[PDB]
Amino acid sequence: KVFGRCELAAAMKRHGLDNYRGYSLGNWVCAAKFESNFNTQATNRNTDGSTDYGILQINSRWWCNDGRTPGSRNLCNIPCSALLSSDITASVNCAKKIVSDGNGMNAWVAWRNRCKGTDVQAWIRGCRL
Ligand SMILES: [Cl-]
Ligand code: NA
Ligand SMILES: [Ru+3]
Ligand SMILES: [Ru+3]
Ligand SMILES: [Ru+3]
């Protein structure tokens, strides 16, 4: 599924992300935009052989199992494919674990480089929430 901006903001809010670990809703929407262009089916292979999955580009090195990242972990205890669903529940619950892990949203490089410090509330501007 390719979510609309407001559609995603609403879904993220329903799933508990608004101010999770102190991150306003617009931070989450901005990160999804630059990670996946709001496409739940987004995948990207990293040069270390790991792969990033779904709307928040969650990496198989640490977070999910894809059976093809030797030496990896599966800290969210899910198949990586779960992260590509139209239902964002798996992505959201995994993202909670990630952002709780010590470096906050800096875990998402595209957040640090494109969202951090910016007017992130613009991402939720005009949405019914
Ligand atoms: Cl933090
Ligand atoms: Na893994
Ligand atoms: Ru939902
Ligand atoms: Ru950890
Ligand atoms: Ru870790």
PDB file of all heavy atoms in Angstrom, residues 31-61, unseen atoms left out:
ATOM      1  N   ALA A  31       9.801  10.823   8.562  1.00  0.00           N
ATOM      2  CA  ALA A  31      10.708   9.654   8.426  1.00  0.00           C
ATOM      3  C   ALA A  31      10.156   8.655   7.440  1.00  0.00           C
ATOM      4  O   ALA A  31      10.866   8.195   6.596  1.00  0.00           O
ATOM      5  CB  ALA A  31      10.916   8.958   9.755  1.00  0.00           C
ATOM      6  N   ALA A  32       8.868   8.337   7.499  1.00  0.00           N
ATOM      7  CA  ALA A  32       8.239   7.440   6.508  1.00  0.00           C
ATOM      8  C   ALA A  32       8.356   7.977   5.101  1.00  0.00           C
ATOM      9  O   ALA A  32       8.631   7.250   4.144  1.00  0.00           O
ATOM     10  CB  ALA A  32       6.792   7.153   6.879  1.00  0.00           C
ATOM     11  N   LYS A  33       8.134   9.295   4.927  1.00  0.00           N
ATOM     12  CA  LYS A  33       8.228   9.907   3.624  1.00  0.00           C
ATOM     13  C   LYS A  33       9.591   9.670   3.007  1.00  0.00           C
ATOM     14  O   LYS A  33       9.714   9.176   1.853  1.00  0.00           O
ATOM     15  CB  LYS A  33       7.957  11.446   3.707  1.00  0.00           C
ATOM     16  CG  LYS A  33       8.141  12.215   2.444  1.00  0.00           C
ATOM     17  CD  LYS A  33       7.083  11.875   1.409  1.00  0.00           C
ATOM     18  CE  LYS A  33       7.319  12.623   0.139  1.00  0.00           C
ATOM     19  NZ  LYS A  33       6.339  12.227  -0.875  1.00  0.00           N
ATOM     20  N   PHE A  34      10.648   9.994   3.754  1.00  0.00           N
ATOM     21  CA  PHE A  34      11.968   9.866   3.190  1.00  0.00           C
ATOM     22  C   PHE A  34      12.549   8.469   3.169  1.00  0.00           C
ATOM     23  O   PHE A  34      13.369   8.155   2.286  1.00  0.00           O
ATOM     24  CB  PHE A  34      12.891  10.895   3.751  1.00  0.00           C
ATOM     25  CG  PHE A  34      12.418  12.332   3.436  1.00  0.00           C
ATOM     26  CD1 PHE A  34      12.275  13.251   4.435  1.00  0.00           C
ATOM     27  CD2 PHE A  34      12.120  12.689   2.135  1.00  0.00           C
ATOM     28  CE1 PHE A  34      11.852  14.526   4.167  1.00  0.00           C
ATOM     29  CE2 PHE A  34      11.698  13.966   1.844  1.00  0.00           C
ATOM     30  CZ  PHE A  34      11.563  14.881   2.856  1.00  0.00           C
ATOM     31  N   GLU A  35      12.098   7.628   4.086  1.00  0.00           N
ATOM     32  CA  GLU A  35      12.449   6.209   4.061  1.00  0.00           C
ATOM     33  C   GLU A  35      11.807   5.418   2.902  1.00  0.00           C
ATOM     34  O   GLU A  35      12.484   4.675   2.191  1.00  0.00           O
ATOM     35  CB  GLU A  35      12.103   5.528   5.410  1.00  0.00           C
ATOM     36  CG  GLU A  35      13.009   5.915   6.588  1.00  0.00           C
ATOM     37  CD  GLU A  35      14.479   5.591   6.406  1.00  0.00           C
ATOM     38  OE1 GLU A  35      14.837   4.824   5.448  1.00  0.00           O
ATOM     39  OE2 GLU A  35      15.294   6.111   7.239  1.00  0.00           O
ATOM     40  N   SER A  36      10.515   5.575   2.712  1.00  0.00           N
ATOM     41  CA  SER A  36       9.764   4.750   1.798  1.00  0.00           C
ATOM     42  C   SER A  36       8.844   5.439   0.811  1.00  0.00           C
ATOM     43  O   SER A  36       8.177   4.765   0.005  1.00  0.00           O
ATOM     44  CB  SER A  36       8.941   3.814   2.633  1.00  0.00           C
ATOM     45  OG  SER A  36       7.822   4.482   3.298  1.00  0.00           O
ATOM     46  N   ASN A  37       8.785   6.746   0.847  1.00  0.00           N
ATOM     47  CA  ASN A  37       7.775   7.443   0.062  1.00  0.00           C
ATOM     48  C   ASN A  37       6.397   6.908   0.356  1.00  0.00           C
ATOM     49  O   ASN A  37       5.515   6.887  -0.500  1.00  0.00           O
ATOM     50  CB  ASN A  37       8.082   7.434  -1.408  1.00  0.00           C
ATOM     51  CG  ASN A  37       7.455   8.652  -2.108  1.00  0.00           C
ATOM     52  OD1 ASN A  37       7.147   9.657  -1.453  1.00  0.00           O
ATOM     53  ND2 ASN A  37       7.233   8.547  -3.373  1.00  0.00           N
ATOM     54  N   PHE A  38       6.173   6.568   1.623  1.00  0.00           N
ATOM     55  CA  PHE A  38       4.908   6.065   2.190  1.00  0.00           C
ATOM     56  C   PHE A  38       4.408   4.739   1.591  1.00  0.00           C
ATOM     57  O   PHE A  38       3.270   4.357   1.752  1.00  0.00           O
ATOM     58  CB  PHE A  38       3.758   7.125   2.004  1.00  0.00           C
ATOM     59  CG  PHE A  38       4.008   8.503   2.602  1.00  0.00           C
ATOM     60  CD1 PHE A  38       3.524   9.620   1.951  1.00  0.00           C
ATOM     61  CD2 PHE A  38       4.629   8.685   3.838  1.00  0.00           C
ATOM     62  CE1 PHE A  38       3.679  10.881   2.503  1.00  0.00           C
ATOM     63  CE2 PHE A  38       4.756   9.905   4.385  1.00  0.00           C
ATOM     64  CZ  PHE A  38       4.291  11.022   3.713  1.00  0.00           C
ATOM     65  N   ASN A  39       5.325   3.964   1.027  1.00  0.00           N
ATOM     66  CA  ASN A  39       5.027   2.661   0.384  1.00  0.00           C
ATOM     67  C   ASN A  39       5.414   1.505   1.318  1.00  0.00           C
ATOM     68  O   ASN A  39       6.607   1.333   1.612  1.00  0.00           O
ATOM     69  CB  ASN A  39       5.786   2.544  -0.936  1.00  0.00           C
ATOM     70  CG  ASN A  39       5.441   1.277  -1.692  1.00  0.00           C
ATOM     71  OD1 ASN A  39       4.662   0.410  -1.242  1.00  0.00           O
ATOM     72  ND2 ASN A  39       5.982   1.177  -2.872  1.00  0.00           N
ATOM     73  N   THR A  40       4.410   0.791   1.822  1.00  0.00           N
ATOM     74  CA  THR A  40       4.574  -0.346   2.752  1.00  0.00           C
ATOM     75  C   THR A  40       5.390  -1.432   2.096  1.00  0.00           C
ATOM     76  O   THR A  40       6.043  -2.151   2.808  1.00  0.00           O
ATOM     77  CB  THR A  40       3.264  -0.975   3.269  1.00  0.00           C
ATOM     78  OG1 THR A  40       2.577  -1.640   2.196  1.00  0.00           O
ATOM     79  CG2 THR A  40       2.332   0.054   3.906  1.00  0.00           C
ATOM     80  N   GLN A  41       5.361  -1.540   0.771  1.00  0.00           N
ATOM     81  CA  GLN A  41       6.152  -2.594   0.065  1.00  0.00           C
ATOM     82  C   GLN A  41       7.596  -2.246  -0.305  1.00  0.00           C
ATOM     83  O   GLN A  41       8.320  -3.008  -0.964  1.00  0.00           O
ATOM     84  CB  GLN A  41       5.363  -3.148  -1.103  1.00  0.00           C
ATOM     85  CG  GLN A  41       4.013  -3.673  -0.706  1.00  0.00           C
ATOM     86  CD  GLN A  41       3.390  -4.500  -1.811  1.00  0.00           C
ATOM     87  OE1 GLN A  41       3.730  -5.684  -1.975  1.00  0.00           O
ATOM     88  NE2 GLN A  41       2.632  -3.857  -2.662  1.00  0.00           N
ATOM     89  N   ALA A  42       8.113  -1.130   0.208  1.00  0.00           N
ATOM     90  CA  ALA A  42       9.426  -0.684  -0.136  1.00  0.00           C
ATOM     91  C   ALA A  42      10.469  -1.645   0.452  1.00  0.00           C
ATOM     92  O   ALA A  42      10.368  -2.019   1.596  1.00  0.00           O
ATOM     93  CB  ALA A  42       9.653   0.665   0.393  1.00  0.00           C
ATOM     94  N   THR A  43      11.433  -2.008  -0.354  1.00  0.00           N
ATOM     95  CA  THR A  43      12.588  -2.799   0.117  1.00  0.00           C
ATOM     96  C   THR A  43      13.877  -2.184  -0.435  1.00  0.00           C
ATOM     97  O   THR A  43      13.928  -1.589  -1.567  1.00  0.00           O
ATOM     98  CB  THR A  43      12.527  -4.336  -0.187  1.00  0.00           C
ATOM     99  OG1 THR A  43      12.565  -4.539  -1.618  1.00  0.00           O
ATOM    100  CG2 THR A  43      11.377  -5.062   0.431  1.00  0.00           C
ATOM    101  N   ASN A  44      14.963  -2.267   0.338  1.00  0.00           N
ATOM    102  CA  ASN A  44      16.248  -1.826  -0.165  1.00  0.00           C
ATOM    103  C   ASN A  44      17.393  -2.701   0.384  1.00  0.00           C
ATOM    104  O   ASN A  44      17.513  -2.898   1.580  1.00  0.00           O
ATOM    105  CB  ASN A  44      16.428  -0.320   0.019  1.00  0.00           C
ATOM    106  CG  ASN A  44      15.459   0.571  -0.951  1.00  0.00           C
ATOM    107  OD1 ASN A  44      15.696   0.674  -2.224  1.00  0.00           O
ATOM    108  ND2 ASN A  44      14.381   1.236  -0.355  1.00  0.00           N
ATOM    109  N   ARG A  45      18.155  -3.291  -0.532  1.00  0.00           N
ATOM    110  CA  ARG A  45      19.330  -4.137  -0.164  1.00  0.00           C
ATOM    111  C   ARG A  45      20.535  -3.250   0.146  1.00  0.00           C
ATOM    112  O   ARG A  45      20.929  -2.414  -0.670  1.00  0.00           O
ATOM    113  CB  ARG A  45      19.656  -5.067  -1.304  1.00  0.00           C
ATOM    114  CG  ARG A  45      20.866  -5.912  -1.167  1.00  0.00           C
ATOM    115  CD  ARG A  45      20.699  -7.119  -0.291  1.00  0.00           C
ATOM    116  NE  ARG A  45      19.355  -7.647  -0.134  1.00  0.00           N
ATOM    117  CZ  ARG A  45      18.746  -8.507  -0.950  1.00  0.00           C
ATOM    118  NH1 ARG A  45      19.382  -8.993  -2.034  1.00  0.00           N
ATOM    119  NH2 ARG A  45      17.527  -8.924  -0.619  1.00  0.00           N
ATOM    120  N   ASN A  46      21.120  -3.462   1.325  1.00  0.00           N
ATOM    121  CA  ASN A  46      22.303  -2.765   1.790  1.00  0.00           C
ATOM    122  C   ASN A  46      23.563  -3.510   1.362  1.00  0.00           C
ATOM    123  O   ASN A  46      23.507  -4.712   1.042  1.00  0.00           O
ATOM    124  CB  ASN A  46      22.232  -2.643   3.305  1.00  0.00           C
ATOM    125  CG  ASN A  46      21.012  -1.922   3.806  1.00  0.00           C
ATOM    126  OD1 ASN A  46      20.305  -2.420   4.703  1.00  0.00           O
ATOM    127  ND2 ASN A  46      20.753  -0.750   3.272  1.00  0.00           N
ATOM    128  N   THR A  47      24.705  -2.815   1.286  1.00  0.00           N
ATOM    129  CA  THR A  47      25.885  -3.445   0.670  1.00  0.00           C
ATOM    130  C   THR A  47      26.476  -4.525   1.578  1.00  0.00           C
ATOM    131  O   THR A  47      27.190  -5.422   1.083  1.00  0.00           O
ATOM    132  CB  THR A  47      26.991  -2.432   0.272  1.00  0.00           C
ATOM    133  OG1 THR A  47      26.894  -1.280   1.109  1.00  0.00           O
ATOM    134  CG2 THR A  47      26.822  -2.032  -1.207  1.00  0.00           C
ATOM    135  N   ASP A  48      26.135  -4.459   2.873  1.00  0.00           N
ATOM    136  CA  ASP A  48      26.466  -5.537   3.810  1.00  0.00           C
ATOM    137  C   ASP A  48      25.570  -6.774   3.722  1.00  0.00           C
ATOM    138  O   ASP A  48      25.726  -7.681   4.505  1.00  0.00           O
ATOM    139  CB  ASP A  48      26.514  -5.022   5.238  1.00  0.00           C
ATOM    140  CG  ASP A  48      25.135  -4.772   5.854  1.00  0.00           C
ATOM    141  OD1 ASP A  48      24.061  -5.043   5.250  1.00  0.00           O
ATOM    142  OD2 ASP A  48      25.118  -4.289   6.985  1.00  0.00           O
ATOM    143  N   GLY A  49      24.637  -6.799   2.782  1.00  0.00           N
ATOM    144  CA  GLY A  49      23.797  -7.980   2.534  1.00  0.00           C
ATOM    145  C   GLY A  49      22.494  -7.995   3.314  1.00  0.00           C
ATOM    146  O   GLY A  49      21.635  -8.815   3.036  1.00  0.00           O
ATOM    147  N   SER A  50      22.358  -7.090   4.264  1.00  0.00           N
ATOM    148  CA  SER A  50      21.084  -6.916   4.992  1.00  0.00           C
ATOM    149  C   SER A  50      20.092  -6.235   4.078  1.00  0.00           C
ATOM    150  O   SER A  50      20.481  -5.636   3.089  1.00  0.00           O
ATOM    151  CB  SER A  50      21.242  -6.141   6.270  1.00  0.00           C
ATOM    152  OG  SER A  50      21.582  -4.780   6.066  1.00  0.00           O
ATOM    153  N   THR A  51      18.809  -6.238   4.455  1.00  0.00           N
ATOM    154  CA  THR A  51      17.808  -5.527   3.654  1.00  0.00           C
ATOM    155  C   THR A  51      16.893  -4.715   4.591  1.00  0.00           C
ATOM    156  O   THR A  51      16.612  -5.120   5.733  1.00  0.00           O
ATOM    157  CB  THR A  51      16.981  -6.547   2.829  1.00  0.00           C
ATOM    158  OG1 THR A  51      17.826  -7.355   2.004  1.00  0.00           O
ATOM    159  CG2 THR A  51      15.882  -5.929   1.948  1.00  0.00           C
ATOM    160  N   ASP A  52      16.482  -3.534   4.108  1.00  0.00           N
ATOM    161  CA  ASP A  52      15.517  -2.689   4.787  1.00  0.00           C
ATOM    162  C   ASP A  52      14.104  -2.916   4.244  1.00  0.00           C
ATOM    163  O   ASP A  52      13.912  -2.985   3.026  1.00  0.00           O
ATOM    164  CB  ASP A  52      15.906  -1.222   4.619  1.00  0.00           C
ATOM    165  CG  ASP A  52      17.268  -0.861   5.199  1.00  0.00           C
ATOM    166  OD1 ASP A  52      17.817  -1.474   6.111  1.00  0.00           O
ATOM    167  OD2 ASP A  52      17.829   0.087   4.658  1.00  0.00           O
ATOM    168  N   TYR A  53      13.123  -2.997   5.150  1.00  0.00           N
ATOM    169  CA  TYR A  53      11.743  -3.323   4.814  1.00  0.00           C
ATOM    170  C   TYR A  53      10.709  -2.338   5.321  1.00  0.00           C
ATOM    171  O   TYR A  53      10.685  -1.949   6.521  1.00  0.00           O
ATOM    172  CB  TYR A  53      11.384  -4.678   5.384  1.00  0.00           C
ATOM    173  CG  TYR A  53      12.225  -5.833   4.925  1.00  0.00           C
ATOM    174  CD1 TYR A  53      13.483  -6.109   5.490  1.00  0.00           C
ATOM    175  CD2 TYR A  53      11.802  -6.634   3.870  1.00  0.00           C
ATOM    176  CE1 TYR A  53      14.250  -7.149   5.002  1.00  0.00           C
ATOM    177  CE2 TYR A  53      12.542  -7.690   3.396  1.00  0.00           C
ATOM    178  CZ  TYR A  53      13.758  -7.983   3.963  1.00  0.00           C
ATOM    179  OH  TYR A  53      14.474  -9.042   3.484  1.00  0.00           O
ATOM    180  N   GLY A  54       9.801  -2.056   4.415  1.00  0.00           N
ATOM    181  CA  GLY A  54       8.547  -1.407   4.729  1.00  0.00           C
ATOM    182  C   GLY A  54       8.609   0.093   4.846  1.00  0.00           C
ATOM    183  O   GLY A  54       9.554   0.732   4.458  1.00  0.00           O
ATOM    184  N   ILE A  55       7.553   0.647   5.443  1.00  0.00           N
ATOM    185  CA  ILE A  55       7.355   2.077   5.467  1.00  0.00           C
ATOM    186  C   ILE A  55       8.402   2.866   6.255  1.00  0.00           C
ATOM    187  O   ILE A  55       8.660   4.049   5.959  1.00  0.00           O
ATOM    188  CB  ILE A  55       5.888   2.311   5.918  1.00  0.00           C
ATOM    189  CG1 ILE A  55       5.340   3.587   5.318  1.00  0.00           C
ATOM    190  CG2 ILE A  55       5.745   2.102   7.420  1.00  0.00           C
ATOM    191  CD1 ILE A  55       3.836   3.638   5.203  1.00  0.00           C
ATOM    192  N   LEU A  56       9.058   2.215   7.225  1.00  0.00           N
ATOM    193  CA  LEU A  56      10.140   2.790   7.965  1.00  0.00           C
ATOM    194  C   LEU A  56      11.486   2.080   7.735  1.00  0.00           C
ATOM    195  O   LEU A  56      12.446   2.300   8.480  1.00  0.00           O
ATOM    196  CB  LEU A  56       9.755   2.841   9.449  1.00  0.00           C
ATOM    197  CG  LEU A  56       8.709   3.923   9.686  1.00  0.00           C
ATOM    198  CD1 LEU A  56       8.092   3.683  11.031  1.00  0.00           C
ATOM    199  CD2 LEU A  56       9.351   5.321   9.613  1.00  0.00           C
ATOM    200  N   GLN A  57      11.573   1.280   6.662  1.00  0.00           N
ATOM    201  CA  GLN A  57      12.847   0.734   6.239  1.00  0.00           C
ATOM    202  C   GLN A  57      13.700   0.081   7.380  1.00  0.00           C
ATOM    203  O   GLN A  57      14.909   0.374   7.531  1.00  0.00           O
ATOM    204  CB  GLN A  57      13.618   1.785   5.454  1.00  0.00           C
ATOM    205  CG  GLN A  57      12.921   2.029   4.122  1.00  0.00           C
ATOM    206  CD  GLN A  57      13.061   0.909   3.114  1.00  0.00           C
ATOM    207  OE1 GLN A  57      14.092   0.800   2.455  1.00  0.00           O
ATOM    208  NE2 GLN A  57      12.033   0.056   2.995  1.00  0.00           N
ATOM    209  N   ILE A  58      13.030  -0.813   8.103  1.00  0.00           N
ATOM    210  CA  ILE A  58      13.531  -1.546   9.230  1.00  0.00           C
ATOM    211  C   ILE A  58      14.457  -2.676   8.723  1.00  0.00           C
ATOM    212  O   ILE A  58      14.090  -3.388   7.767  1.00  0.00           O
ATOM    213  CB  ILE A  58      12.380  -2.044  10.120  1.00  0.00           C
ATOM    214  CG1 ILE A  58      11.680  -0.866  10.757  1.00  0.00           C
ATOM    215  CG2 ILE A  58      12.887  -3.040  11.135  1.00  0.00           C
ATOM    216  CD1 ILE A  58      10.580  -1.178  11.716  1.00  0.00           C
ATOM    217  N   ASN A  59      15.649  -2.768   9.306  1.00  0.00           N
ATOM    218  CA  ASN A  59      16.791  -3.517   8.782  1.00  0.00           C
ATOM    219  C   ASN A  59      16.869  -4.920   9.395  1.00  0.00           C
ATOM    220  O   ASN A  59      16.670  -5.079  10.582  1.00  0.00           O
ATOM    221  CB  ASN A  59      18.066  -2.766   9.057  1.00  0.00           C
ATOM    222  CG  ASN A  59      19.226  -3.372   8.340  1.00  0.00           C
ATOM    223  OD1 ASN A  59      19.438  -3.151   7.186  1.00  0.00           O
ATOM    224  ND2 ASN A  59      19.933  -4.179   9.006  1.00  0.00           N
ATOM    225  N   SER A  60      17.205  -5.896   8.571  1.00  0.00           N
ATOM    226  CA  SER A  60      17.195  -7.324   8.928  1.00  0.00           C
ATOM    227  C   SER A  60      18.472  -7.674   9.756  1.00  0.00           C
ATOM    228  O   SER A  60      18.573  -8.800  10.329  1.00  0.00           O
ATOM    229  CB  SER A  60      17.138  -8.148   7.644  1.00  0.00           C
ATOM    230  OG  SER A  60      18.219  -7.886   6.797  1.00  0.00           O
ATOM    231  N   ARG A  61      19.438  -6.749   9.795  1.00  0.00           N
ATOM    232  CA  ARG A  61      20.686  -6.944  10.558  1.00  0.00           C
ATOM    233  C   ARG A  61      20.403  -7.141  12.025  1.00  0.00           C
ATOM    234  O   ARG A  61      20.979  -8.029  12.651  1.00  0.00           O
ATOM    235  CB  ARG A  61      21.736  -5.830  10.342  1.00  0.00           C
TER     236      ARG A  61
END
